[PDB]
Amino acid sequence: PRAKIVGEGEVKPSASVDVSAFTAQPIKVVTQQRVSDEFMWADADYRLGVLQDLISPALGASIGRAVDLIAFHGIDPATGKAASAVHTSLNKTKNIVDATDSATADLVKAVGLIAGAGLQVPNGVALDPAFSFALSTEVYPKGSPLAGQPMYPAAGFAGLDNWRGLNVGASSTVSGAPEMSPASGVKAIVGDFSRVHWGFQRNFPIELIEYGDPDQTGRDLKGHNEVMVRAEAVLYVAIESLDSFAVVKE
Amino acid sequence: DLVKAVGLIAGAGLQVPNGVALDPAFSFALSTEVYPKGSPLAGQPMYPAAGFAGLDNWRGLNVGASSTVSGAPEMSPASGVKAIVGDFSRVHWGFQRNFPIELIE
Amino acid sequence: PRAKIVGEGEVKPSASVDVSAFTAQPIKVVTQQRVSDEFMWADADYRLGVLQ
Amino acid sequence: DLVKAVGLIAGAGLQVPNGVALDPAFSFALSTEVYPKGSPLAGQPMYPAAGFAGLDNWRGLNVGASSTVSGAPEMSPASGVKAIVGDFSRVHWGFQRNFPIELIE
């Protein structure tokens, strides 16, 4: 609020309070794979261990990717269009930084768009694997003093566990390379990730269906001798603001 | 630009200023500035002590970073002032009487 | 696989798997040396381990 | 300019320099660069500068900053001088008689 200069006789006025309430609706996500029994006996007696060692973590991760895809772009991962009843996503913000040849120089601008407004200094960085690789092996420019040497010594062609203060995680869910069709040219989102509240209201394990018609394509699961492997979860994504997030766009 | 500013004050004597005040953006740009080329350590952080956080003191001068030196929300057009340097021992201020939060019913 | 947002009463769809395979044929490799028996005697006479 | 200045006196291999007179507007013009970890003299001021506290010595030379060297409010168009480097053992100054403060009634 803004105070006002008042004389001995003048009137002491009032101000208005600015309040903004945000709401997030719970969304359930499903992931189904239609396997045949002829395969099921095969992985059993041929000894390959396909379901427990290969297929299950694919769905268990298919949820984790769904969360990020909701938080960053607000799309239903399957269709890859624009998910309804999600309203806002992390990408759609006013703070944009033009991608430069120097990654380290372009990230420090992104954190600048947040720390320069008066917000709490960012503590989280999420970047695409390509830009994540460019950041790790970013050797000093030519002509500079410590040229040729790596800006980060313990990189070694591997993603950084920690940056200059901030916590860094790298995944392909930032650009959404396979999910989205034109692929939003986002290299990295940077910000205070305490401004985003997310959670699993209901997280089920891996369900194995032997009956009925879960895919709803007519084909039943005992008329075609096929099993169903499904993974369902209930999650929510709320964002307190958007002026506390910067985006590096190509 | 800041050294130019202190140069204008120290140029005509008047004692070297001891106080600085910066706009948040200018403060960040100061905390993360790097030596310009044509110098050793070009590419290295000029103030490695503070990362992404405003300085406590700058080259013997006390610094403070608030959005008031620009007056971004209060002023209708943001005054061009980004930073102000001077001998803040001159400025005399004070609360003659301060009241706690009052509830009028 | 890609998850899918569904509502109360909305159809829960399915995805697929993209498998593949590779093959390798076993190859037989040999190498032979022709050593006269007159040489193996000198190999043990002058005690120069040429064959050992 | 400072290095070329000390190079002008110490260049012929004659007259070893000592003692440097600086101006407040020129003390800030100097970079606050510091030697890295790799080389010796690590964590030591590379130049007189102005940000460092209690710096009276630099590369074996004495350092003192005053507004007098520039010309101060004393001069009107300013002498333009920023720094003076040379063996100050060649200067013999002195007070032949120093009187205290006196009140003429």
3-class DSSP assignment, residue C15: strand
Between chain C and chain A, are at least 3 CB pairs below 8 A? Answer: yes
Contact predicate D35/D46, CB 8 Å: yes
Between chain D and chain C, are at least 3 CB pairs below 8 A? Answer: no
Q: Can you give the residue ranges of every domain in chain A?
A: 1-92+195-240, 93-194+241-250
Interface test with D, best of B1, B8, B16, B39 (most D CBs within 10 A): B16
- A59/C1 CB distance under 8 A: yes
CB < 8 Å to B53, chain A? 121
How do strand B19-22 and strand A124-127 relate by DSSP bridges?
unpaired
Q: Rounded CA gap, B60 and D32, in Å?
A: 12
Nearest to A106, CA basis, from A87, A78, A125: A125
Nearest to A165, CA basis, from D27, B66, C24, B32: B32
Q: Among A30, A55, A215, whose Cβ lies nearest the Cβ of C3?
A: A30
CB < 8 Å to D73, chain B? 12-14
Q: Rounded CA gap, B10 and B61, in Å?
A: 14
First-to-last CA distance in chain C?
60
- Interface residues of chain C, partner chain A, Cβ below 8 Å: 1-6, 11-17
- B58/D50 CB distance under 8 A: no
B70: its two tokens: 């620009």
CB < 8 Å to A141, chain B? 43
Q: Rounded CA gap, A153 and B76, in Å?
A: 48
Kind and range of the H or E element at C38?
helix C37-45
CA dist A196 → A29, A82, A192, A200, B42 (Å): 20, 20, 8, 14, 38
- C11/A216 CB distance under 8 A: yes
CB < 8 Å to C16, chain A? 33-34
Nearest CA in chain A to B27: A116
Nearest to A40, CA basis, from A32, A50, A31: A50
Q: What residues have CB less than 8 Å from B4, skipping those under 6 apart?
A: none
Contact predicate C5/A83, CB 8 Å: yes
Structural method: cryo-EM
Q: Rounded CA gap, A244 and A94, in Å?
A: 10
Residue C41 gets the label, from left (phi > 0), alpha (psi -120 to 50) or beta, of: alpha
Q: Rounded CA gap, A112 and A93, in Å?
A: 15
